[PDB]
Design a protein around this ligand. Structure first.
Ligand SMILES: NC(=O)c1ccc[n+]([C@@H]2O[C@H](COP(=O)([O-])OP(=O)(O)OC[C@H]3O[C@@H](n4cnc5c(N)ncnc54)[C@H](O)[C@@H]3O)[C@@H](O)[C@H]2O)c1
Ligand SMILES: NC(=O)c1ccc[n+]([C@@H]2O[C@H](COP(=O)([O-])OP(=O)(O)OC[C@H]3O[C@@H](n4cnc5c(N)ncnc54)[C@H](O)[C@@H]3O)[C@@H](O)[C@H]2O)c1
Ligand SMILES: NC(=O)c1ccc[n+]([C@@H]2O[C@H](COP(=O)([O-])OP(=O)(O)OC[C@H]3O[C@@H](n4cnc5c(N)ncnc54)[C@H](O)[C@@H]3O)[C@@H](O)[C@H]2O)c1
Ligand SMILES: NC(=O)c1ccc[n+]([C@@H]2O[C@H](COP(=O)([O-])OP(=O)(O)OC[C@H]3O[C@@H](n4cnc5c(N)ncnc54)[C@H](O)[C@@H]3O)[C@@H](O)[C@H]2O)c1
Lengths: 248, 247, 245, 245
């Protein structure tokens, strides 16, 4: 019951890590809104999760479109109650180095990750600040803390999210809204994990002291801790959940 | 039941944050060994905690004395079972800058913090490695991540613990032992917090959240890091600091 | 003579820190290209600097416009020689928190800082990689390492630059191109310094003063120099102790 | 002449990186004192360096012995003038994980690195603070910023130095003494480099090579110089990109 009486909106909640966050949040007693670019996916996943009295509802929105994400959060609150938590999990990745990256792809990666975090937070903050209560979990990555070959826009975007999190915590922690970033290591099994996939495999695994990559469930547990009132003194943190990657 | 079937030794467990960690760990179903320089206090605190079927036992040891901390860990395991977790909470603080610090005072702060973490971990690691299962939580501080005026030895000590944590995670994460460091902000109410007490408003201003931490705040982070829900968390310097290191 | 036979392009070179970098680089024997949104300013500043045989030339370009910045870099190389160094100094700042920021202003701040760094680097990298020799200095800030109240877009932008720098170093260090970021503390006297204008502010700086454009320029000149041959991927704090406390 | 009228004491100055620092500092016009555990080595190295008008003097001291390091600094100042800079370069390394490290070896690694930095700085700070002028460069490592397998005591010691540097900068930057740490990557060619001696190790370095003593020396000379007047509290990675990935 660690999230009893919490109401959590999760962007990109239809699949992957976002969906695993939803499952764990429901386990802990929260009501959840899955907000995803793919409306059908958000609704199918919310149906799948709403067993045994658990309450999950789905909403379609592109986090890069201010009016759409704002409308989704408004609909979510009308449906499941005023938000107490927001997880800015929506993100995309792609390849391209500074010398050869496509400028349009660059912009889209920055938009979904950085602009989406900004716009979804902006929508949620109106209510959270009014109520002097909220918790926002942003999505960094090991790729936001160190450099990853051939991923210039993505490392820029996740780097932006890491420090934006610090900035938001500076503004809002004293006003009742905690803001933290989870920084996951590689999670292979999601759509993104598959997108980014022998000797080269072994070298990649060798960057992880724990000797395995992460699961969506591994990351979801850290997010559930940060959302909970047991983390009342945690704000502004870039919490590495990465099997040791950034420790070496 | 987040720590069901866990057996957790907590150095400095007799009081303050260590005691709060013990309370939360028992809440989550763990068996706890309080290991404290003050043997009587460890025992009395363990007795106090042991209600409602909760199992806490107290042991005396100075973490800077290898034979003594080794004996205490062995005795704990005889009493409550093989360790699954170790919290290196024992620490001392003090004042003194590089230009005026006394060498003996410097050495003692380094000893309890860094050498204690080393020796207590060394003792626990034999069993944890043998069983390919363990979780160690070390105690950094905001004072291990940034510089604090007039606390040279203490900032060096906590700085050491922060990077030693990364080093330990590098060695052991693949062998079944996670090692992490909680880095608390100021916690006023403990013996250490009291010891270190417009100057007030200035200190508070460094904390975006607008208050200092409680032992309970810190205990919750430690309980998370101890739990199997934190299975992919290792090598982390986890700031639990009201936003201090974010600005 | 620390930058003898070096050819350095400096975005935002017409004024402020960029101009101070130009002055110091010329002192050390470099030829410099001042690339500024304000073309007249770039030209006037370059002429002012071109004394005692020093070679400084001005170019007009908005770093957020790929064609324009690419053209300026191409012309710089035609004018003063193939680049050996690029300083992505161009940046803008503004105020606004997540809950109330102008989304258009947010985009412009991200564009000049992050996209400008990307596009200018992209143009320079063709030649630098072809020659297996280059040094790129990006502009972070203390605002890219910690959070600053009421500056969401700018902290996001400088945060991006800090980690983009690491990413660029990962790609290119082994190919002969070092990439580093200078992270300055507050520098009062520039246009940006004045725009953003406080014993409380000063209290954030252990050294007990804010920085000068010259302070920052010296760090950039070191990073540009071959004396810094093993320095790459670094986020170098030049900040009077700000991020140390 | 970047260090004209500077007077720099270098612990561990008789060989390796310390000696390279001495050479570069003399190049830039400083007077130097080499203070080394090996007195004869300090003397021989100082004599070797004292050509063409360069002034280098050697002294014997174990930095872990307060009386010895204090005497050496005093003797240095009698010979070459009041110190303006101190480089806490003396250090030792060794292997051992938490589970198997010998406690005596642990203490010795912690002592030379951390306690030596403390004691040497303490001796130098009396004069520097009295004059409201100094610059201190401590020696971290990539091993002070991240974990290195099988080097528990050394990683703890270098970690201590990195944050002690921040703490010292907090105390003294406003009192006229800058304090910074260089954090070098692997440097193969020194006594320590040889002691610790694969392609797997090299793969940790984006730049595709290990460092030289000269690479590290240049960063130290920059930090010592007044061109770095606003640089304090910094943990400056000079590491071929190691900590960037
Ligand atoms: N998979 C990894 O290895 C990994 C590692 C570190 C961090 N991350 C980060 O974790 C988060 C989740 O990653 P994942 O692996 O679960 O991703 P995923 O691609 O498996 O799932 C992402 C979900 O977000 C949605 N989405 C994409 N763009 C959107 C938009 N503009 N608006 C609303 N929704 C949108 C997708 O439709 C999708 O359902 C991301 O921010 C990602 O960058 C992933
Ligand atoms: N109180 C704070 O503000 C604060 C902030 C950040 C980090 N910390 C750290 O948290 C930890 C706990 O702090 P606290 O405020 O609870 O401390 P505390 O002084 O209130 O209590 C510490 C306990 O450790 C025991 N202890 C001391 N030396 C010991 C030794 N050599 N061997 C065994 N036990 C010993 C004491 O007897 C005591 O019971 C420490 O590592 C401390 O450095 C404290
Ligand atoms: N002044 C400070 O306190 C401070 C502190 C840390 C970092 N910085 C950073 O240092 C850099 C320089 O700052 P400054 O104080 O000298 O700035 P400034 O505003 O004084 O000067 C900036 C120059 O860049 C030019 N410029 C602006 N937009 C451009 C564009 N789209 N394309 C090309 N040129 C453009 C301007 O015309 C101007 O000449 C910036 O990246 C800034 O973010 C400044
Ligand atoms: N060589 C590397 O790969 C590397 C990398 C990063 C950092 N470092 C650090 O750089 C510094 C220099 O390393 P190096 O490779 O030149 O070492 P080195 O072993 O080659 O030389 C060190 C010198 O310090 C002296 N010394 C040792 N103990 C002393 C003591 N107790 N008191 C006074 N002098 C003492 C030695 O006599 C020796 O002349 C050290 O702090 C080291 O930890 C080295």
């Amino acid at each position: 019951n660690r999230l009893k009486n919490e109401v959590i909106a999760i962007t990109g909640g239809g699949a992957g890590i976002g969906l695993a966050i939803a499952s764990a949040a429901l386990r802990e007693g929260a009501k959840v809104a899955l907000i995803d670019l793919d409306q059908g996916l958000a609704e199918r996943s919310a149906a799948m999760l709403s067993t045994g009295g658990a309450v999950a509802k789905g909403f379609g929105a592109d986090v890069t479109k201010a009016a759409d994400i704002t409308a989704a959060i408004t609909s979510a609150e009308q449906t499941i109650g005023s938000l107490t938590g927001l997880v800015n999990n929506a993100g995309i990745a792609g390849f391209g180095s500074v010398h050869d990256a496509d400028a349009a792809a660059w912009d889209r990666i920055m938009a979904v990750n950085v602009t989406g975090t900004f716009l979804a937070s902006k929508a949620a903050l109106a209510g959270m600040l009014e109520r002097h209560k909220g918790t926002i979990v942003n999505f960094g990555s090991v790729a936001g803390l160190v450099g990853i070959p051939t991923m210039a826009a993505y490392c820029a975007a996740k780097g932006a999210i890491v420090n934006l999190t610090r900035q938001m915590a500076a503004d809002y922690s004293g006003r009742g809204v905690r803001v933290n970033a989870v920084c996951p290591g590689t999670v292979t099994s999601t759509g993104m994990g598959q997108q980014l996939l022998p000797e080269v495999q072994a070298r990649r695994l060798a960057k992880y002291p724990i000797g395995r990559f992460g699961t969506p469930e591994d990351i979801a547990e850290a997010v559930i801790f940060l959302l909970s009132d047991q983390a009342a003194f945690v704000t502004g943190a870039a919490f590495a959940v990465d099997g040791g990657m950034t420790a070496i």
